[PDB]
């Protein structure tokens, strides 16, 4: 199977996908995030953050509060299964995590914690 996915954040609080599938024969999974927009990190920051569907809103709430100096992530946040850093115009970043950190049947959400994203700057991640 394939074990990585390419994801674009644009200038309008948007990923170019809202659903990721992780094949369970994969040992590791890799998310390749890039920012094809023109806006700096401070006005249009994007990160890819992975948590349980239950933990999502708590990670985002505390994240937005942490501010830009913390990459919009409450420090030591145990709920974050994996995450890229925050990136702005031009930049890119890749995160790799162990598929054994996941479970079949459990609901996971990927999302961005930069402030201003609607309740739509998110998507599902599924172990199949």
Partner from its own copies, Cu ion, none binding residue 33, C-beta < 5-8 Å depending on class: none
Contact yes or no for 8/36 (Cβ under 8 A)? yes
Q: Three-class SS string for the chain? A: CCCEEEEEECCCCCECCCEEEECCCCCEEEEEEECCCCCCHHHHCECCEEEECCCHHHHHHHHHHHCHHHCCCCCCCCCCCEECCCECCCCEEEEEEEHHHCCCCCCEEEECCCCCCCCCCEEEEEEC
Among 33, 49, 87, 112, binds Cu ion (CB under 5 A): 112
Among 46, 74, 83, 122, binds Cu ion (CB under 5 A): 46
> Which of these segments, 28-36, 44-52, 55-63, 80-88, binds Cu ion (CB under 5 A)?
44-52
What is the contact surface with its own copies in residues (CB under 8 A)?
10-13, 36-44, 53-58, 61, 64-65, 67-68, 85, 87-92, 104-105, 107, 115-116, 119, 126-128
Partner from its own copies, Cu ion, none binding residue 1, C-beta < 5-8 Å depending on class: Cu ion
Partner from Cu ion, its own copies, none binding residue 83, C-beta < 5-8 Å depending on class: none
Structure token digits, residue 67: 């501010």
Q: In whole angstroms, how close is the CB of 124 to Cu ion at the nearest point?
A: 16
- Site of interaction with Cu ion (CB under 5 A): 1, 9, 46, 112, 114
């Amino acid at each position: 199977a394939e074990c990585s996915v390419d994801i674009q954040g644009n200038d309008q609080f948007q990923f170019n996908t809202n659903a990721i599938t992780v094949d369970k024969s994969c040992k590791q999974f890799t998310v390749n995030l890039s920012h094809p927009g023109n806006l700096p990190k401070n006005v249009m920051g994007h990160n890819w953050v992975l948590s349980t569907a239950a933990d999502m809103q708590g990670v985002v709430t505390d994240g937005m509060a942490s501010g830009l100096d913390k990459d919009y992530l409450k420090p030591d946040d145990s709920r974050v299964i994996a995450h890229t850093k925050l990136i702005g115009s031009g930049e890119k970043d890749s995160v790799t995590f162990d598929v054994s950190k996941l479970k079949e049947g459990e609901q996971y959400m990927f999302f961005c914690t930069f402030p201003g994203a609607s309740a739509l700057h998110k998507g599902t991640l599924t172990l199949k």
